């Protein structure tokens, strides 16, 4: 009901929208990660139009080295975005 609580539900809701598309329903594979970014982060990140950007992003976010982005790794990605957003500001 508060805007922060709305933010918490959004984080959960969007991760699962994408993670559940294919394979492990609790992790984002590259194609799921790419679409999440392109569809849902278009005001903060440049549309990914090259395979190697998809690959490099996953390499960066894939902290435990299993080829996918789990929810912990996703939150780290969100922390990275949110931090980078101020600054600017």
């Amino acid at each position: 009901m508060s805007e922060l609580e709305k933010a918490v539900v959004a984080l959960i809701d969007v991760f699962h929208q994408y993670s559940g598309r294919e394979g492990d329903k609790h992790k984002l594979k590259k194609s799921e990660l790419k679409e999440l970014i392109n569809n849902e982060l278009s005001h903060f990140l440049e549309e990914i139009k090259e395979q190697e950007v998809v690959d490099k992003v996953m390499e960066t976010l894939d902290s435990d080295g299993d080829g996918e982005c789990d929810f912990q790794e996703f939150m780290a990605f969100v922390a990275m975005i949110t931090t980078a957003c101020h600054e600017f500001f």
Partner: peptide
């Protein structure tokens, strides 16, 4: 606000 990509990585 493009926040991107090398920043990031």
């Amino acid at each position: 606000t493009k926040i991107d990509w090398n920043k990031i990585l």
